[PDB]
Design a protein around this ligand. Structure first.
Ligand code: HEM
Ligand code: HEM
Ligand code: HEM
Ligand code: HEM
Lengths: 141, 146, 141, 146
């Protein structure tokens, strides 16, 4: 359950991300592939080389979706409906992996937002990513 | 893995009454029904749209038998699960691209199946010994991922 | 979410548990303590030996809550409200543990309901226990 | 666990620039703030009503120093984590009753803190090396649970 204060912290923090969203999304993916190798099993068709266009492009897609969620934090289920169906019916990623990507997104934000990553914002961002993950795996069965 | 003389006897004794063909098919079938996303690895198996479809699928029964058979071999080498499943670990990673988390789910489903099949004979202590085994097999299979 | 079929399956299976619910609750706990020893860290004040009346008494309370949840399957958040506050703010049980108890409850049910524990019912009960767990950990932060 | 020579060097090098007491208080504080249920063991620490209260609590800071100091001394024995934390493992299980899941949470919070602290110097490869270290430490602290 995201509280009003949580939504304020997330919108403020994401705003600062601004135009680096895609670049940060790419970094988060690279951090995941290196730290948790088993997540690579879902991208055997990708060139997972550092700086690959495939990863940069995917990172931008991931960030745009998160941006969309922050914009509609009060109605994430409806806002991410399409992505929810896609992950549940087509991709079928085991739910465990969402926690790993969320963690890597947190580390990326921490490394790029020195002034904004306070303990309270850290807490709100973690809750936010968990909510997004929950919405994305809600139609699995 | 490390099992006490008591846990070892419990595991082996129970396995002697297991019809691998029967149990394997039940375990894999329930995995695909209870955790549907695991179906992503068996697109070529046919119809898996319903529990009856999944449970009756001959390809599922066939594969289930193969999996439990290899699992059976590990029970014979509880002292070296890592070396025993090294080749299959590499295969599941490099060729099959199977998320090791799936090994954990199958282990849990297998325990439910043994409980369903054996009833009261599958006592808390016996389950405890089997949870150690499936966790060891799952970690042995994920050992070669990179 | 729980579909009408899921609800039908859970009510049917639980109806079968009937007056044995308490005894099954105790067995589930015993299975959990033996299979996942780390869960014992939350009951250092309990005598966890087999046959313990403490485990038995606690088992009946867990079962009664599950019975209450089944009776209000379409209003679990309110029906389990006090239990959610308790686990979140007093007991503070790491959420990971709910998955361990859910699994042990399923195993206990499988061992006592040969006829009713079909693959479809198995799936429905797992969804049900996951929903109960979600409600019980919703107020953690 | 098994770290390559280059991975050990990255961990060691980065650590030499860490203010153990400072990072220790920061990590434990954030743990209690981000995952509030971990506060259960520190009721006697006083006021933990708000993030500022937690971060500013002298007892929280004191414990963080204690915890990170032990972690720090463990980095000298990367090749023998289990032996190094054997007694502390026993203590956390038998006397403190600390769910090992808490060690995993602290490990992730520590990594976030190092990233906040070092920014761009906390590269993906460096993070990967530290992830292995915190997972190894958490495993070593949970090894003697029974
Ligand atoms: C924060 C949660 C996540 C978000 C917002 C997210 C978002 C997306 C989006 C927007 C797409 C592309 C949609 C399109 O191009 O039509 C996508 C595709 C996909 N996602 Fe996710 N995703 C998340 C988590 C995961 C996780 C945890 C994994 C795996 C470890 C994963 C694996 C995939 C894969 C393999 C694809 C398809 C890639 C391709 O073949 O092009 N996703 N995701
Ligand atoms: C944990 C116990 C498991 C063991 C011991 C095991 C064992 C095996 C064995 C012996 C093979 C046959 C390889 C061959 O004949 O060339 C195989 C194939 C395969 N396994 Fe596993 N496996 C296990 C779990 C899983 C799980 C949980 C999944 C995924 C949900 C999986 C997916 C596959 C697939 C997709 C194949 C190839 C089937 C085909 O040829 O179409 N395995 N496994
Ligand atoms: C299906 C999930 C669960 C349900 C329905 C449930 C239900 C309950 C109920 C009804 C109580 C007793 C409250 C009272 O006496 O007023 C309780 C207490 C408690 N629960 Fe849970 N619980 C669940 C899971 C957990 C888990 C996973 C753990 C930890 C491994 C846990 C640990 C405790 C503890 C330590 C108490 C206090 C017992 C005492 O000291 O008397 N609960 N729970
Ligand atoms: C890297 C992880 C950790 C290490 C190396 C570690 C280390 C220590 C050390 C060295 C002590 C003092 C032992 C003594 O008094 O002889 C201690 C005490 C304690 N630890 Fe841990 N610990 C870790 C994580 C945790 C976590 C995450 C918690 C709980 C959230 C925890 C809770 C406690 C408590 C409650 C005490 C007792 C404090 C007191 O009585 O003053 N520890 N730990």
């Amino acid at each position: 359950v995201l509280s009003p204060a949580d939504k304020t912290n997330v919108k403020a923090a994401w705003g600062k991300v601004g135009a680096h969203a895609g670049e940060y999304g790419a970094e988060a993916l690279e951090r995941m592939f290196l730290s948790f190798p088993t997540t690579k099993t879902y991208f055997p068709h990708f060139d997972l080389s550092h700086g690959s266009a495939q990863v940069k492009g995917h990172g931008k897609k991931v960030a745009d979706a998160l941006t969309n969620a922050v914009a509609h934090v009060d109605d994430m289920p409806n806002a991410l409906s399409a992505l929810s169906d896609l992950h549940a019916h087509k991709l079928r990623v085991d739910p465990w992996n969402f926690k790993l990507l969320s963690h890597c997104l947190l580390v990326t934000l921490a490394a790029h937002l020195p002034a904004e990553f306070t303990p309270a914002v850290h807490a709100s961002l973690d809750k936010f990513l968990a909510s997004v993950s929950t919405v994305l795996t809600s139609k699995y069965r | 893995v490390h099992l006490t003389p008591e846990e070892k006897s419990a595991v082996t004794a129970l396995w002697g009454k297991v019809n691998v063909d029967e149990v394997g098919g039940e375990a894999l079938g329930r995995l695909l029904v209870v955790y549907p996303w695991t179906q992503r690895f068996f697109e070529s198996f046919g119809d898996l749209s319903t529990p009856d479809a999944v449970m009756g699928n001959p390809k599922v029964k066939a594969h289930g038998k193969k999996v439990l058979g290899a699992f059976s071999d590990g029970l014979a080498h509880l002292d070296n699960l890592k070396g025993t499943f090294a080749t299959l670990s590499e295969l599941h990673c490099d060729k099959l691209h199977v998320d090791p988390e799936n090994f954990r789910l199958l282990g849990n489903v297998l325990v439910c199946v043994l409980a369903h099949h054996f009833g009261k004979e599958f006592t808390p202590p016996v389950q405890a010994a089997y949870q150690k085994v499936v966790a060891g097999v799952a970690n042995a299979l994920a050992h070669k991922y990179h």
